Design a protein around this nucleic acid. Sequence first.
RNA 1: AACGACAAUGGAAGUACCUUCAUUUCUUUUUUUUACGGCCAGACCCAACCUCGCCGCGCAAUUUCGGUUCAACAUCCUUCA
RNA 2: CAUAAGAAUUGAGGCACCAAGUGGGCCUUCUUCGGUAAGCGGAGCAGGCGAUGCGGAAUGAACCGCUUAGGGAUAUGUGG
RNA 3: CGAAUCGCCACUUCUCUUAUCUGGGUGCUCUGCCCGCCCUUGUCGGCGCCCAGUACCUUCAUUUUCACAAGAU
Lengths: 183, 116, 179, 189, 157, 200
Amino acid sequence: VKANYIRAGRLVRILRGPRQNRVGVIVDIVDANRVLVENPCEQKMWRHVQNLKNVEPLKFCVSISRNCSTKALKEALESKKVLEKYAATKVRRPHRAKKAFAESTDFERYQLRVAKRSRAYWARKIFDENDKKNPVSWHKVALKKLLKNAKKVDSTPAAKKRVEKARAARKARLAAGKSKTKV
Amino acid sequence: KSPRLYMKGTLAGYTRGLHGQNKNTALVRIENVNTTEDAKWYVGKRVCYVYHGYKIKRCVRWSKAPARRSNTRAIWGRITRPHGTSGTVRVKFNGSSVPASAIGRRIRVYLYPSRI
Amino acid sequence: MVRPHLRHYCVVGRETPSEKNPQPTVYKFEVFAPNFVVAKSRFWRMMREKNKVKSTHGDVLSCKVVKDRKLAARNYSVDIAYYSQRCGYTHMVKEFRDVCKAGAVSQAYNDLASRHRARYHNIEVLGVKSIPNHEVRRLNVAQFHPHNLSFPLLQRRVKAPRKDRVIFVKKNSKRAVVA
Amino acid sequence: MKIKSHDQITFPEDVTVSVKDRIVTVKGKRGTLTKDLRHLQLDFRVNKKLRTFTAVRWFGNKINNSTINTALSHVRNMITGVTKGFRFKVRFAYAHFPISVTVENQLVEIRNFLGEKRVRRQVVADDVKVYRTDAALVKDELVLEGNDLEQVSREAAVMHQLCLVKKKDIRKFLDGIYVQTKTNIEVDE
Amino acid sequence: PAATKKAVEKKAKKVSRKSPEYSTVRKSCKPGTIAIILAGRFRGRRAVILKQLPKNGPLVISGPMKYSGVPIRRIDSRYIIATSTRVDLTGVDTSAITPEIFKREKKVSDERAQLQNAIDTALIQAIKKDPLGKEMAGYLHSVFTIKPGDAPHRLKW
Amino acid sequence: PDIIVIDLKDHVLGRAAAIVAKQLLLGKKITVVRCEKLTIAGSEIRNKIKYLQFLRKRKLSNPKLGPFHHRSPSDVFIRTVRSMLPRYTKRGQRALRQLVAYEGVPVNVVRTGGRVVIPKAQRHNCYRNERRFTVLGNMCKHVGWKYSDVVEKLEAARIEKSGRHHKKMEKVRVAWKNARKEALKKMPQKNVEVLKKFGL
RNA sequence: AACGACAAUGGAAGUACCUUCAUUUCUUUUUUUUACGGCCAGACCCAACCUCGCCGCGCAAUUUCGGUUCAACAUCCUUCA
RNA sequence: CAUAAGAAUUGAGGCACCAAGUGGGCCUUCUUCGGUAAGCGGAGCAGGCGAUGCGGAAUGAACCGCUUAGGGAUAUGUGG
RNA sequence: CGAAUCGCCACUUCUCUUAUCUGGGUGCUCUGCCCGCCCUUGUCGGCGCCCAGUACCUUCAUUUUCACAAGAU
C-alpha cells in the first residue's frame, strides 16, 4: 500500500527547510531528490527548488502541465481549492497550533488544561454505566467484592449474627463518633 | 508541590582535545535543551550542585531559620558559552571544581539571576 | 539541483603589453571555477601552454561572473577531458538535464570523483550545452524525460535524535517506519 | 540510492493469489499454495482487482531487474501446482545389477544397488506422493507427484542425489535412479 | 523597539550621560506587570509589580494576597519573569513606600496591615477593570510551576 | 528520567550500543528487552566468523582468563556496550554497576507506560530498507545459546497476558473515549480561548 | 573513626576529613552575594558596497516532437531547442 | 642623486681582546655513488635530531603542528 | 529585610537531592484494520466506508464552570 505517487501538480509539504510548511506544488521534479515548486504566496513560496527529502506530498494531485507557469498555476490551483482541502486536513492541527502554543500565556494555558480536567472526573467515570462497566478498580472491585461480600452479607462468611454485632459496631463507631466530637 | 524550577542537567566533562583537557572548564548538557542557540540564553547562569555531605557534619555557621544545619552542601558556578548543536555548555566556577567526582552527576540549572 | 557549488566566471584577456605585439588579439571563456583566483589561473594556464604564454608577461582585462538563463531545466550535454591514471588525457561524454550548467559541472566533478575515481585538476571539463531535441541522449535523462513522468518512492530518514527535538529519549509513542 | 521500489505482483486468471504481504497465497483447483518472500518485494500495482496484476518495475539497479521475473515465474508456478499439479516420473536404471524400489507410501524404499549396499529410504514429504507403477509397461518406475513442483522436484533431485556412486570410474558408472519426466500431473484447467 | 528609529534623539547628539536623580529602570520593564517570582521566599508565585522603590533597586510586588497568597515585597527584576500582562496602577498610590518599611527590623506591623490593604484595593479595581487576574485562570491563582522540559527560552508567550 | 527500560526489537546493534554508551555515561539505569531482536548485519556466516574467531582465542596458559562468552543475546550487547564504554574506568565501572539489561523480558512492569525505544537505534531506520540483515537470536542460536527455545515459550505467554490486559483496556478506553464531549466549548472567550483550536 | 580491581608510591585538580595556621569581626565595623559613571570590551536589530553589462522577458518566428487518450487528434509546443 | 622611467631592508655599524667547550654522530625532503638487496653501505645540497619540550599522527628521537618566562582571558595550529 | 541547597518530595518515597506512569502485538504497505470501492482501472484518479489515531494520564471535587482565605514577622 504504497501510494501517494508524485504526480506533477502534487501538493508537497515543506518538511524541514526554513521554508517548511509553506506550500507549493510540483512544477518540475528536478530529478532524484529535487523539485521545482511554485505557489501564490506572496512571500514564500515563490518558485522554489526544493529537496525531496524535505518534502511530503499531500495527496492533493491536480492536473496541470509538467513544467509550468505561475500564472496558469496560480489560477488553476486556486481553482483547485486544494489548499483549503489540505487546510481541512487534520494532520494540520497541532502544528499550526504549535506556532500558536509558543505564543500563548498562562491563563490560556491553564484553561486549556482545565478543559480536560473538567472532563476528566466528569464524563467517563462519571457515570453510571461505564463505572458499572470496567469499572474503576475500586468500583469494579466494590461491585465484585460485593459479590464476594455477598459473602458476608449474603453468605458464607459472616453477617447473620456478627453483622448484627456489626450493627452494634456501627453504632459503636457512631457511639465513639458522637462521643469523640463531643470530647 | 514545590520549587522544581531548574533543569536537571548533568555535568559531563572538562574541555578537551587529546593531551590537554581543561579541568578549569567543565561541560553540562542541560536536559531538554541540546540546542545551542537556545543554550545561548542560559549563558552565565549560575548552576548548582547540591550534594549531601556524607561526612562530618559541618555547617559551621547558622543562617537558616537560623542554625541552618545540614550536612548537605551545595556548589554554585556560572556557564560560559554553549557549543555543539546538541547544546554542550561550558561552565566555570568562581572557585575551582565542584568536587572531584561530581562529574557525571546530575546538576541543576537555574534560569536566573533573571534577564527578562 | 542548486547547491550552487562551483562559480562561473567569464574571463576576457589579452597578450602582450609590448608593442612587439602592437595590438593583441583577445581571448574569452566562460569557465567554471570556484573563484576568480582560480579562474584567472586557469585562463592563463592554457595560455601558458596551449598558447605558450606566461601570465606574468601578459594581461587579463577582465574576469566577470556569468549567469544562467532562468528558472527551469534545459538539457545539458557534457564533454570531458581527464588526464589522470598516469595516462593522461582521456575524453568522455556525459549527459545532464537541469536548470544550471554550474550544477552540472559540479556534479560531474563529484561524479568523476566517485565514479571514475578522479581528481579535479586533472579534468578539464570541455563543455556543457542545452540539448534541444526530444533527445537529449543518455538513458537516465531520457528515463526521466517522460511527459507524465511521475513516481512512487519510499523508505528513509529525517534526523532521529536532534536539537530541533530531540536526542536519545525517543520514542514517546510507538514504531513502524512512518509514511 | 536509485529507485527500484517495493511492492508486489503479476497475474493471469483463474486462480486466486494473495496480492498481500511478502506472501502470495495462491488458490485454485488443486487447492491453495502460498509463499512468503523475503526482500522480494518490488513495484506492484494492480491493474484489475481481479483481473490484472503486474509488477514490472520503474527504475532501480541492475541486480534488481532480474528478480522481478524470477519472482513472477515462481508464483506462476505456485499457480501451476494449484492448477495442474506436478508429476514426476523416475525410472531405476541398471544393467549389471538389477535394482528395486518400492514405496511404503509414507516413505520410499530403495533396494538393490550393486547388489545393494545400504537401503536408500526417503520419507515421503508432504505432497510429493510416490507411486511405483508397473503395468502399462510402467517400468522400474517411480512416480512422484503432487502440487508443488519444487517440492516434488526437490525430493526428486534429492533422489538423483540419493543414487550417487563413487570410486572406480564414471566411464563404467551409470546405473542409478534417474529422472525420467518432470511434468504436471496433467493438463488440467 | 519599536519601528523606525535612532530613537528618542534630538538633532544634537548620539552620545552620553544617563540617570541623574531619577531612577534608572530594569532595562526591559514597565510597571503594572504580572510577575512570577522566581526564587527565595515566594518562588513560583503570581504577583503584580507596582513600582521600583525610590532608588535603583526593587519592585514592589503584590498579588493581592487572596489571589495568590502574595505578600507584597521588594524584589529584583532579575528574580522575576515579567508577564506580557499589564495594568495601570494609576489609582494605586504606592506613594509612601520606602524601604525602611521593608527592613525586617521594620516589618505584624500595623503599617503593613494598612498599607498592603490599601494597595491591594487599588490593584483590585484595576484588576477588575480588566478581568482574569482573577476570575478563573487566575491569572494569579495557579498551582503548577514548571513542568519538566520546554524551558523559558523556549517559552515565547 | 528514572528506572529506565528500552525495547530492543529491531535495533541497530552498534548504534544502539553507542547510544546507550553515552547514556550510561551521562549516568542512568536503563534496561533492555527484545534483545533477541537486536540485530546483526547481513549473514549468519559473517556473524559467526566473527564470533567464532572471538570465541576461538585463548589466554594460552590459562585460557580461562581472556574473554568469556555468556552467550546470551543480552550479554553480547551489553558487553559491547562495555566495549564502547571505557572499562577500566573506575567511573565507567560504577557506571556499569548502574546499568541493567535482562535478556527477554520479566513482565509485570509494562502496563501504563513502557513505549520506549531510542532514536537512531531503529534498525530499519538505520539500515537500508533493502539491504540484507541477520537477527541476534539467530546468532546466539548459532553459537547455541541455551534458552532460545524457552524464551520463545516465555514470549508467547507474555504476549498473551499482555493481550488480556490489552482487551481489558480496550474496553475501558472506550469509556475513556467517552470522556466529555458535552459542556466543553464553554471554555471561555475573553483574553482569547481557542481551546477549540488548541486541544479540543 | 584513615583506606583498598590490583602496580606501587606519582602530577594535577577538587572535595571530604583534619590534628591544622594565621587573619579579621557587625546594636554606625566584617562576609557572601546584587548593584554601579564614565568606563573600560566582547554579541543582537534593522540600512547599504556603487555599477556598465547581460540575463531575461515579452512577442513573434523557424526548426523542434512530447504530457493528455485505450492511442490518434485537439493540445506545431510538454519543452527542451 | 627624479624618471620622464625600475628595490626592499637596514631594532646599529665599524672594529677587537681573549679564553672554552667540542673533533664517534645520528635522522630527513632533495641529488647521488656501491651492491640484488638491505631499517645496508657510501657521498652532495638543505633541514633536523642530537642538545625541547608543548600540540597533533591509538604507538613512535628526527613524521604533522608548533617551540617554550609565569599566569590569566580569548582565538586559532595540526588534528578532530 | 531585595539572591543565598530551605525547609518539599522524602530512616514506610527511592535506582537514586523533586510529573503520574498515557502501557500489550505488527509491517513499511497505509494518518483509524483503516477499510472498502469505484473509476480510460493507473504510476492512478475519484468516491465511498468506519470510529479508530486525532501518540499521549499532570490528581479540589477544581481549574466545562463562578470563585475564595491566607502569607509579608
